């Protein structure tokens, strides 16, 4: 059976805490709607 | 590449991919969730041999 | 003024002795690692260091330290370095291009036809990973390639191996230089309420700046601010009428 | 917040991990990069003014 | 090494001779597929 993955596969990339900000990464992650 | 939106008292609340749609690439380049009407330049295209 | 330093609870001295004073050493074609953790290790009992100065190594704290058992020819010790051109070094043990630890050289006079090294393999080697010829140092006479003992150390993360140094009390609402688990800084420490995940450690706001710190001992919340500074200016009526001036301090509540 | 080719992007981390002859080159690289950035900002400010 | 419906998620990654294991948890609805 063949399904799709949406809005899934996100984790905290590092171990520091932010608030009301935006950050971009380049590591291995699960692409949306895969 | 991803782009993650935190919050106050904040875990991960919303995130949109950076390599899914041209609109997604635009959101990833302007670094905001709301883009007003206009023309924008994002990157460069090239053909891989 | 003053000083605050907070470290985790001190433990027993962890035994570096038997891993440096070991009666047997494994070969290179079988690579064993010796994991070292949960320590207060003293380095005064102890070459070349790539990334960390050896004199200042005693102060800063680390997450985890890894030691490796490794026996190699005499003149080949200079080929154990990041991005070395050795094909034999490319086939037995590759160091990554980015490196942090140190390489130690030791003598083995007492030690034949027992140690080998792999020199035939298809493709290169990714670092820190796991057809044969016998070594040449079987003759115990001094030739020039007499064997040496080489141990290499490899070192944002939770920390349990820190330097032995006294922990002091904590001062509040008065700017001071602080040292939290090797992270140094200077400013006002404030007991503000910003939430942390129970496994989470540090806090940064915008520009890769240490803003919030979880206390390593009582597990409370400390916000870090830079204490007062700014531009100063002098106003004068010109040095033809008087010599008295006035001083303006910019954007400070100057109590 | 960029390292400009140095081993780390924080000056206090450089001065807490190196002696006074191996940290000098990293300090030099930070000085050069931040000088370039500040000069660029000053020039753009002058034209806008 | 010895240590001591719903959807549980394990993320495995491998780099620099190290392997990271990540865990998660979420209460889901009983259905044949997976909801978005
Ligand atoms: C660490 O040391 C402090 C001071 O003695 C003690 O109160 C605390 O229980 C110890 N353990 C932890 C996990 O903080
Ligand atoms: C400066 O601080 C004092 C005490 O915190 C306060 O009473 C005063 O109003 C402050 N000044 C200004 C301009 O807010």
PDB file of N, CA and C in Angstrom, chain C residues 68-132:
ATOM      1  N   UNK C  68      41.738   6.028  22.230  1.00  0.00           N
ATOM      2  CA  UNK C  68      41.868   4.967  21.244  1.00  0.00           C
ATOM      3  C   UNK C  68      43.193   4.235  21.403  1.00  0.00           C
ATOM      4  N   UNK C  69      43.142   2.909  21.288  1.00  0.00           N
ATOM      5  CA  UNK C  69      44.331   2.069  21.324  1.00  0.00           C
ATOM      6  C   UNK C  69      44.835   1.820  19.907  1.00  0.00           C
ATOM      7  N   UNK C  70      46.141   2.000  19.711  1.00  0.00           N
ATOM      8  CA  UNK C  70      46.680   2.163  18.368  1.00  0.00           C
ATOM      9  C   UNK C  70      48.193   1.986  18.394  1.00  0.00           C
ATOM     10  N   UNK C  71      48.693   0.974  17.680  1.00  0.00           N
ATOM     11  CA  UNK C  71      50.125   0.698  17.596  1.00  0.00           C
ATOM     12  C   UNK C  71      50.556   0.727  16.134  1.00  0.00           C
ATOM     13  N   UNK C  72      51.643   1.459  15.875  1.00  0.00           N
ATOM     14  CA  UNK C  72      52.030   1.916  14.545  1.00  0.00           C
ATOM     15  C   UNK C  72      53.561   1.949  14.533  1.00  0.00           C
ATOM     16  N   UNK C  73      54.166   1.872  13.339  1.00  0.00           N
ATOM     17  CA  UNK C  73      55.617   1.959  13.175  1.00  0.00           C
ATOM     18  C   UNK C  73      56.195   3.261  13.739  1.00  0.00           C
ATOM     19  N   UNK C  74      57.530   3.312  13.770  1.00  0.00           N
ATOM     20  CA  UNK C  74      58.215   4.418  14.419  1.00  0.00           C
ATOM     21  C   UNK C  74      58.121   5.732  13.666  1.00  0.00           C
ATOM     22  N   UNK C  75      58.447   5.725  12.376  1.00  0.00           N
ATOM     23  CA  UNK C  75      58.440   6.950  11.587  1.00  0.00           C
ATOM     24  C   UNK C  75      57.063   7.298  11.039  1.00  0.00           C
ATOM     25  N   UNK C  76      56.074   6.433  11.239  1.00  0.00           N
ATOM     26  CA  UNK C  76      54.721   6.676  10.759  1.00  0.00           C
ATOM     27  C   UNK C  76      53.904   7.541  11.714  1.00  0.00           C
ATOM     28  N   UNK C  77      54.448   7.859  12.895  1.00  0.00           N
ATOM     29  CA  UNK C  77      53.735   8.648  13.900  1.00  0.00           C
ATOM     30  C   UNK C  77      53.454  10.061  13.395  1.00  0.00           C
ATOM     31  N   UNK C  78      54.280  10.568  12.480  1.00  0.00           N
ATOM     32  CA  UNK C  78      54.039  11.880  11.900  1.00  0.00           C
ATOM     33  C   UNK C  78      52.923  11.875  10.864  1.00  0.00           C
ATOM     34  N   UNK C  79      52.406  10.707  10.488  1.00  0.00           N
ATOM     35  CA  UNK C  79      51.296  10.638   9.548  1.00  0.00           C
ATOM     36  C   UNK C  79      49.940  10.549  10.232  1.00  0.00           C
ATOM     37  N   UNK C  80      49.891  10.626  11.557  1.00  0.00           N
ATOM     38  CA  UNK C  80      48.629  10.638  12.291  1.00  0.00           C
ATOM     39  C   UNK C  80      48.313  12.103  12.571  1.00  0.00           C
ATOM     40  N   UNK C  81      47.622  12.726  11.620  1.00  0.00           N
ATOM     41  CA  UNK C  81      47.257  14.134  11.666  1.00  0.00           C
ATOM     42  C   UNK C  81      46.045  14.312  10.769  1.00  0.00           C
ATOM     43  N   UNK C  82      45.237  15.351  10.976  1.00  0.00           N
ATOM     44  CA  UNK C  82      44.111  15.596  10.066  1.00  0.00           C
ATOM     45  C   UNK C  82      44.574  15.858   8.641  1.00  0.00           C
ATOM     46  N   UNK C  83      43.799  15.294   7.704  1.00  0.00           N
ATOM     47  CA  UNK C  83      44.029  15.308   6.253  1.00  0.00           C
ATOM     48  C   UNK C  83      45.482  15.026   5.868  1.00  0.00           C
ATOM     49  N   UNK C  84      45.981  13.864   6.271  1.00  0.00           N
ATOM     50  CA  UNK C  84      47.299  13.410   5.865  1.00  0.00           C
ATOM     51  C   UNK C  84      47.212  12.687   4.526  1.00  0.00           C
ATOM     52  N   UNK C  85      48.309  12.754   3.769  1.00  0.00           N
ATOM     53  CA  UNK C  85      48.356  12.258   2.398  1.00  0.00           C
ATOM     54  C   UNK C  85      48.693  10.773   2.319  1.00  0.00           C
ATOM     55  N   UNK C  86      48.907  10.121   3.458  1.00  0.00           N
ATOM     56  CA  UNK C  86      49.311   8.729   3.468  1.00  0.00           C
ATOM     57  C   UNK C  86      48.243   7.763   2.997  1.00  0.00           C
ATOM     58  N   UNK C  87      48.564   6.977   1.966  1.00  0.00           N
ATOM     59  CA  UNK C  87      47.651   5.937   1.499  1.00  0.00           C
ATOM     60  C   UNK C  87      47.521   4.840   2.549  1.00  0.00           C
ATOM     61  N   UNK C  88      48.631   4.496   3.207  1.00  0.00           N
ATOM     62  CA  UNK C  88      48.576   3.587   4.347  1.00  0.00           C
ATOM     63  C   UNK C  88      47.756   4.199   5.475  1.00  0.00           C
ATOM     64  N   UNK C  89      47.933   5.504   5.717  1.00  0.00           N
ATOM     65  CA  UNK C  89      47.094   6.206   6.680  1.00  0.00           C
ATOM     66  C   UNK C  89      45.648   6.282   6.211  1.00  0.00           C
ATOM     67  N   UNK C  90      45.428   6.328   4.897  1.00  0.00           N
ATOM     68  CA  UNK C  90      44.077   6.268   4.354  1.00  0.00           C
ATOM     69  C   UNK C  90      43.466   4.879   4.468  1.00  0.00           C
ATOM     70  N   UNK C  91      44.283   3.851   4.700  1.00  0.00           N
ATOM     71  CA  UNK C  91      43.796   2.483   4.768  1.00  0.00           C
ATOM     72  C   UNK C  91      43.687   1.921   6.180  1.00  0.00           C
ATOM     73  N   UNK C  92      44.424   2.450   7.154  1.00  0.00           N
ATOM     74  CA  UNK C  92      44.343   1.913   8.509  1.00  0.00           C
ATOM     75  C   UNK C  92      43.534   2.783   9.461  1.00  0.00           C
ATOM     76  N   UNK C  93      43.771   4.092   9.476  1.00  0.00           N
ATOM     77  CA  UNK C  93      43.119   4.972  10.445  1.00  0.00           C
ATOM     78  C   UNK C  93      43.087   6.381   9.877  1.00  0.00           C
ATOM     79  N   UNK C  94      41.891   6.881   9.586  1.00  0.00           N
ATOM     80  CA  UNK C  94      41.710   8.213   9.023  1.00  0.00           C
ATOM     81  C   UNK C  94      41.218   9.173  10.095  1.00  0.00           C
ATOM     82  N   UNK C  95      41.909  10.300  10.237  1.00  0.00           N
ATOM     83  CA  UNK C  95      41.418  11.359  11.103  1.00  0.00           C
ATOM     84  C   UNK C  95      40.575  12.342  10.302  1.00  0.00           C
ATOM     85  N   UNK C  96      39.510  12.887  10.889  1.00  0.00           N
ATOM     86  CA  UNK C  96      38.675  13.841  10.151  1.00  0.00           C
ATOM     87  C   UNK C  96      39.403  15.152   9.906  1.00  0.00           C
ATOM     88  N   UNK C  97      38.938  15.876   8.883  1.00  0.00           N
ATOM     89  CA  UNK C  97      39.562  17.146   8.520  1.00  0.00           C
ATOM     90  C   UNK C  97      39.408  18.182   9.626  1.00  0.00           C
ATOM     91  N   UNK C  98      38.279  18.171  10.326  1.00  0.00           N
ATOM     92  CA  UNK C  98      38.106  18.976  11.525  1.00  0.00           C
ATOM     93  C   UNK C  98      38.445  18.125  12.741  1.00  0.00           C
ATOM     94  N   UNK C  99      39.332  18.635  13.590  1.00  0.00           N
ATOM     95  CA  UNK C  99      39.829  17.861  14.714  1.00  0.00           C
ATOM     96  C   UNK C  99      39.898  18.758  15.939  1.00  0.00           C
ATOM     97  N   UNK C 100      39.775  18.145  17.114  1.00  0.00           N
ATOM     98  CA  UNK C 100      39.738  18.885  18.367  1.00  0.00           C
ATOM     99  C   UNK C 100      40.734  18.395  19.407  1.00  0.00           C
ATOM    100  N   UNK C 101      41.096  17.121  19.409  1.00  0.00           N
ATOM    101  CA  UNK C 101      41.870  16.525  20.475  1.00  0.00           C
ATOM    102  C   UNK C 101      43.366  16.591  20.256  1.00  0.00           C
ATOM    103  N   UNK C 102      44.073  15.637  20.858  1.00  0.00           N
ATOM    104  CA  UNK C 102      45.526  15.628  20.896  1.00  0.00           C
ATOM    105  C   UNK C 102      46.043  14.233  20.572  1.00  0.00           C
ATOM    106  N   UNK C 103      47.302  14.177  20.145  1.00  0.00           N
ATOM    107  CA  UNK C 103      47.981  12.928  19.826  1.00  0.00           C
ATOM    108  C   UNK C 103      49.181  12.795  20.755  1.00  0.00           C
ATOM    109  N   UNK C 104      49.295  11.646  21.417  1.00  0.00           N
ATOM    110  CA  UNK C 104      50.339  11.406  22.403  1.00  0.00           C
ATOM    111  C   UNK C 104      51.280  10.322  21.899  1.00  0.00           C
ATOM    112  N   UNK C 105      52.583  10.554  22.048  1.00  0.00           N
ATOM    113  CA  UNK C 105      53.612   9.615  21.615  1.00  0.00           C
ATOM    114  C   UNK C 105      54.252   8.958  22.831  1.00  0.00           C
ATOM    115  N   UNK C 106      54.352   7.630  22.803  1.00  0.00           N
ATOM    116  CA  UNK C 106      54.882   6.870  23.927  1.00  0.00           C
ATOM    117  C   UNK C 106      55.810   5.779  23.413  1.00  0.00           C
ATOM    118  N   UNK C 107      56.697   5.322  24.293  1.00  0.00           N
ATOM    119  CA  UNK C 107      57.688   4.309  23.959  1.00  0.00           C
ATOM    120  C   UNK C 107      57.209   2.915  24.350  1.00  0.00           C
ATOM    121  N   UNK C 108      57.611   1.923  23.552  1.00  0.00           N
ATOM    122  CA  UNK C 108      57.421   0.507  23.889  1.00  0.00           C
ATOM    123  C   UNK C 108      58.713  -0.261  23.570  1.00  0.00           C
ATOM    124  N   UNK C 109      59.614  -0.290  24.554  1.00  0.00           N
ATOM    125  CA  UNK C 109      60.893  -0.972  24.383  1.00  0.00           C
ATOM    126  C   UNK C 109      60.746  -2.485  24.515  1.00  0.00           C
ATOM    127  N   UNK C 110      59.856  -2.941  25.405  1.00  0.00           N
ATOM    128  CA  UNK C 110      59.737  -4.367  25.696  1.00  0.00           C
ATOM    129  C   UNK C 110      59.240  -5.164  24.495  1.00  0.00           C
ATOM    130  N   UNK C 111      58.292  -4.620  23.740  1.00  0.00           N
ATOM    131  CA  UNK C 111      57.798  -5.297  22.550  1.00  0.00           C
ATOM    132  C   UNK C 111      58.621  -4.862  21.344  1.00  0.00           C
ATOM    133  N   UNK C 112      56.698  -8.274  17.585  1.00  0.00           N
ATOM    134  CA  UNK C 112      57.260  -9.429  16.896  1.00  0.00           C
ATOM    135  C   UNK C 112      56.364  -9.866  15.741  1.00  0.00           C
ATOM    136  N   UNK C 113      56.154 -11.176  15.621  1.00  0.00           N
ATOM    137  CA  UNK C 113      55.315 -11.739  14.564  1.00  0.00           C
ATOM    138  C   UNK C 113      53.863 -11.858  15.036  1.00  0.00           C
ATOM    139  N   UNK C 114      53.315 -10.737  15.503  1.00  0.00           N
ATOM    140  CA  UNK C 114      51.974 -10.747  16.075  1.00  0.00           C
ATOM    141  C   UNK C 114      51.063  -9.647  15.543  1.00  0.00           C
ATOM    142  N   UNK C 115      51.621  -8.529  15.087  1.00  0.00           N
ATOM    143  CA  UNK C 115      50.834  -7.374  14.673  1.00  0.00           C
ATOM    144  C   UNK C 115      50.859  -7.238  13.156  1.00  0.00           C
ATOM    145  N   UNK C 116      49.701  -6.918  12.582  1.00  0.00           N
ATOM    146  CA  UNK C 116      49.533  -6.780  11.142  1.00  0.00           C
ATOM    147  C   UNK C 116      48.806  -5.476  10.842  1.00  0.00           C
ATOM    148  N   UNK C 117      48.665  -5.172   9.551  1.00  0.00           N
ATOM    149  CA  UNK C 117      47.883  -4.022   9.119  1.00  0.00           C
ATOM    150  C   UNK C 117      47.342  -4.282   7.721  1.00  0.00           C
ATOM    151  N   UNK C 118      46.086  -3.898   7.501  1.00  0.00           N
ATOM    152  CA  UNK C 118      45.449  -4.083   6.204  1.00  0.00           C
ATOM    153  C   UNK C 118      45.894  -2.988   5.244  1.00  0.00           C
ATOM    154  N   UNK C 119      46.334  -3.389   4.051  1.00  0.00           N
ATOM    155  CA  UNK C 119      46.795  -2.446   3.044  1.00  0.00           C
ATOM    156  C   UNK C 119      46.069  -2.595   1.716  1.00  0.00           C
ATOM    157  N   UNK C 120      45.229  -3.616   1.562  1.00  0.00           N
ATOM    158  CA  UNK C 120      44.470  -3.845   0.338  1.00  0.00           C
ATOM    159  C   UNK C 120      42.989  -3.699   0.645  1.00  0.00           C
ATOM    160  N   UNK C 121      42.370  -2.664   0.085  1.00  0.00           N
ATOM    161  CA  UNK C 121      40.943  -2.441   0.261  1.00  0.00           C
ATOM    162  C   UNK C 121      40.438  -1.587  -0.891  1.00  0.00           C
ATOM    163  N   UNK C 122      39.250  -1.926  -1.381  1.00  0.00           N
ATOM    164  CA  UNK C 122      38.610  -1.168  -2.446  1.00  0.00           C
ATOM    165  C   UNK C 122      37.893   0.035  -1.841  1.00  0.00           C
ATOM    166  N   UNK C 123      38.141   1.211  -2.404  1.00  0.00           N
ATOM    167  CA  UNK C 123      37.538   2.432  -1.917  1.00  0.00           C
ATOM    168  C   UNK C 123      38.281   3.019  -0.727  1.00  0.00           C
ATOM    169  N   UNK C 124      37.956   4.273  -0.428  1.00  0.00           N
ATOM    170  CA  UNK C 124      38.550   4.965   0.705  1.00  0.00           C
ATOM    171  C   UNK C 124      37.769   4.651   1.979  1.00  0.00           C
ATOM    172  N   UNK C 125      38.154   5.301   3.073  1.00  0.00           N
ATOM    173  CA  UNK C 125      37.555   5.060   4.378  1.00  0.00           C
ATOM    174  C   UNK C 125      36.942   6.343   4.915  1.00  0.00           C
ATOM    175  N   UNK C 126      35.690   6.258   5.352  1.00  0.00           N
ATOM    176  CA  UNK C 126      35.127   7.334   6.144  1.00  0.00           C
ATOM    177  C   UNK C 126      35.720   7.276   7.553  1.00  0.00           C
ATOM    178  N   UNK C 127      35.902   8.427   8.207  1.00  0.00           N
ATOM    179  CA  UNK C 127      36.647   8.447   9.476  1.00  0.00           C
ATOM    180  C   UNK C 127      35.934   7.703  10.599  1.00  0.00           C
ATOM    181  N   UNK C 128      36.743   7.164  11.520  1.00  0.00           N
ATOM    182  CA  UNK C 128      36.294   6.515  12.756  1.00  0.00           C
ATOM    183  C   UNK C 128      35.403   5.301  12.469  1.00  0.00           C
ATOM    184  N   UNK C 129      35.929   4.370  11.672  1.00  0.00           N
ATOM    185  CA  UNK C 129      35.146   3.221  11.228  1.00  0.00           C
ATOM    186  C   UNK C 129      36.010   1.975  11.130  1.00  0.00           C
ATOM    187  N   UNK C 130      35.353   0.821  11.162  1.00  0.00           N
ATOM    188  CA  UNK C 130      36.010  -0.445  10.880  1.00  0.00           C
ATOM    189  C   UNK C 130      35.497  -1.000   9.552  1.00  0.00           C
ATOM    190  N   UNK C 131      45.916  -9.786   1.700  1.00  0.00           N
ATOM    191  CA  UNK C 131      45.112  -8.741   2.343  1.00  0.00           C
ATOM    192  C   UNK C 131      45.762  -8.197   3.610  1.00  0.00           C
ATOM    193  N   UNK C 132      46.749  -8.921   4.131  1.00  0.00           N
ATOM    194  CA  UNK C 132      47.445  -8.539   5.349  1.00  0.00           C
ATOM    195  C   UNK C 132      48.933  -8.818   5.194  1.00  0.00           C
TER     196      UNK C 132
END
